[PDB]
Write a protein that binds this ligand. Sequence first.
Ligand SMILES: CNC(=S)c1cccnc1
Length: 165
Amino acid sequence: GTSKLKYVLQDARFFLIKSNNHENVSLAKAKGVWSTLPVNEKKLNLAFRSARSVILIFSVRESGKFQGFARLSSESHHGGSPIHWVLPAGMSAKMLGGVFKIDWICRRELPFTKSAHLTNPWNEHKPVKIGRDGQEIELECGTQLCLLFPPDESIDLYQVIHKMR
Ligand SMILES: CNC(=S)c1cccnc1
């Protein structure tokens, strides 16, 4: 193991991403990308410049689980390869902001039952599973949440560490 993981998470910022469906998380995992609404895009871009790592922790709504976590490798950009997201009913692709590149750190799931002892000070100390899309997770809570995930032995954090700057 957990030492490189702890190194990547040191002084990181953490954001809860609430996905409407599994398809979008599958796309994010396959293509290494995420796109969010402008209100959250602006926050993530600010955070990316502010901290050595910005971690997105994903949860599919109504799944009762987190599906993994990833580190931003870029601010958002426009004009790249299109992504055929399955958007919420009533939302068009033009309503999204730009695309963030992300490097997955863990593609394994974690059930909410395992995080019940973790509360988020930045959301009224409610259990960390509770939060709107884009809710920031305070450092200690976010670190402990990430350390609860099963180790993902398919991941080598060597290349992620070299991106930290
Ligand atoms: C791929 N991004 C999706 S589906 C989304 C929708 C609404 C808010 N944030 C993100």
